[PDB]
Amino acid sequence: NTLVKQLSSKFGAISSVLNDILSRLDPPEAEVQIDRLITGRLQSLQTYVT
Amino acid sequence: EKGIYQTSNFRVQPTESIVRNVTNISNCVADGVSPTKLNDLCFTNFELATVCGPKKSTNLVKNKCVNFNFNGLTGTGVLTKSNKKFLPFQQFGRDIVDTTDAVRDPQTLEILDITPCSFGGVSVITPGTNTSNQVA
Amino acid sequence: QSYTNFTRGVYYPDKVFRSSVLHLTQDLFLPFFSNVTWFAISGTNGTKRFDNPVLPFNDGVYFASTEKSNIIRGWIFGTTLDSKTQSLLIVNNATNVFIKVCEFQFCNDPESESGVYSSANNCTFEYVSQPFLFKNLREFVFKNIDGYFKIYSKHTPGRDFPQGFSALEPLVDLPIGINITRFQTLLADYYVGYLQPRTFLLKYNENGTITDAVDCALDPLSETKCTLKSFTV
Ligand SMILES: *[C@@H]1O[C@H](CO)[C@@H](O)[C@H](O)[C@H]1NC(C)=O
Ligand SMILES: *[C@@H]1O[C@H](CO)[C@@H](O)[C@H](O)[C@H]1NC(C)=O
Numbered sequence A: 001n002t003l004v005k006q007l008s009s010k011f012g013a014i015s016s017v018l019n020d021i022l023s024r025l026d027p028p029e030a031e032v033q034i035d036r037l038i039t040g041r042l043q044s045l046q047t048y049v050t
Numbered sequence B: 001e002k003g004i005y006q007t008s009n010f011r012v013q014p015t016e017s018i019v020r021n022v023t024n025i026s027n028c029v030a031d032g033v034s035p036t037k038l039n040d041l042c043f044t045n046f047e048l049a050t051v052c053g054p055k056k057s058t059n060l061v062k063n064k065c066v067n068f069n070f071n072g073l074t075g076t077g078v079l080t081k082s083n084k085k086f087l088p089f090q091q092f093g094r095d096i097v098d099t100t101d102a103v104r105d106p107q108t109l110e111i112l113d114i115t116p117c118s119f120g121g122v123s124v125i126t127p128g129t130n131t132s133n134q135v136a
Numbered sequence C: 001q002s003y004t005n006f007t008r009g010v011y012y013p014d015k016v017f018r019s020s021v022l023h024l025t026q027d028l029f030l031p032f033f034s035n036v037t038w039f040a041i042s043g044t045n046g047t048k049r050f051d052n053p054v055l056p057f058n059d060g061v062y063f064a065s066t067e068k069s070n071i072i073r074g075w076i077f078g079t080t081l082d083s084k085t086q087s088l089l090i091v092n093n094a095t096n097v098f099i100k101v102c103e104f105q106f107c108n109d110p111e112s113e114s115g116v117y118s119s120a121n122n123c124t125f126e127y128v129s130q131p132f133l134f135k136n137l138r139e140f141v142f143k144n145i146d147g148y149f150k151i152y153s154k155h156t157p158g159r160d161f162p163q164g165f166s167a168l169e170p171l172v173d174l175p176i177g178i179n180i181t182r183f184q185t186l187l188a189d190y191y192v193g194y195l196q197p198r199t200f201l202l203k204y205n206e207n208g209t210i211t212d213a214v215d216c217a218l219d220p221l222s223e224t225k226c227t228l229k230s231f232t233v
């Protein structure tokens, strides 16, 4: 449950939904917000596996 | 070597999209966001309800994996008739882990449950390439 | 007149359906066991049948009307309330509810068939909705956000207030960018309290109706219940 709830976290992003980031930002900015979310989700998976 | 290996993941792809009647700031078609094209977004008041840019409504497709957009709420899933009883105020349903599992159809106000389209692991059963190249 | 034992004023925080869940949410709510002023105060039983006082509007206000005869007619939400600026006039008609944003000095404020007319100048928005109409309680919550005035209500068909839990439902969402700091209730009794930021644990049943709630900050047990997201500890 914790692992799935973390998907809704923004981690400092403009929005937690990748489709909103892609729809609202020009790619050079979308990549930054997406990378932020990638870091947040990847850290969540590493925490779960550990 | 002989054994079972997890190599990938199966997903069922959507085959069609659903887009869901004002052609006229409120109650008008529009024409924060860095791209120059704002006509594909629905703006609550811009601050990201109404004033949504132009789009063409489609038919409602059920029992198939589809890409839906209901007044700005987008996603991929299988739409089925819901047995849930929404209050006339409520527009969306949520699960115990705060994900969307139901919507009301902007037109006709049908309550639809959203089941995600099936996916799962890909496991390959191999006799071993020193015996046979047939796999399951 | 302080009537502080009250634990009413919970409303649906959003237009989202939930089934058999406990949802912990931080929003503007009337605290449980807060001081709710009981209106001896009302002008018709005050000095020469007039001068119902003007009350503050702090973040939002909980209001309830207990009059089964529908004597109480409406509200004015504004700042100076003297025609210098626009105010939001919400009046309950026998067949409808009529909302105006005009600026004026007087309305009902200086027996039967009292006049309800005002200067009603310079409105930019107007709305018409369904009427509010044996004992019943008519509960309202008036909440402001930047750019919107939201009205929540529940008309519950009662002499004694400690009835069962009932959550208020949204009544209207008005996109009116109006600065509100003071308001007046138009009579021709009242329970008025103020909202504060609080976290509440709201219990939604299978049909999506809120059936109970825990005010997390009221007491240590409510805090434990919120921490565990359960009404049983
Ligand atoms: C237009 O939208 C309203 C929304 O309630 C719906 O009731 C109506 O049927 C729609 N028009 C058509 C032609 O379907
Ligand atoms: C609202 O009116 C009060 C009047 O005292 C003023 O002090 C306040 O700054 C106003 N707020 C806005 C957002 O105009």
Ligand SMILES: *[C@@H]1O[C@H](CO)[C@@H](O)[C@H](O)[C@H]1NC(C)=O
Residues within 6 Å of the ligand: B085, C205, C206, C207
């Ligand atoms: C939901 O409300 C209907 C109203 O008739 C009632 O029949 C039904 O039993 C309710 N379901 C639950 C789970 O409370």
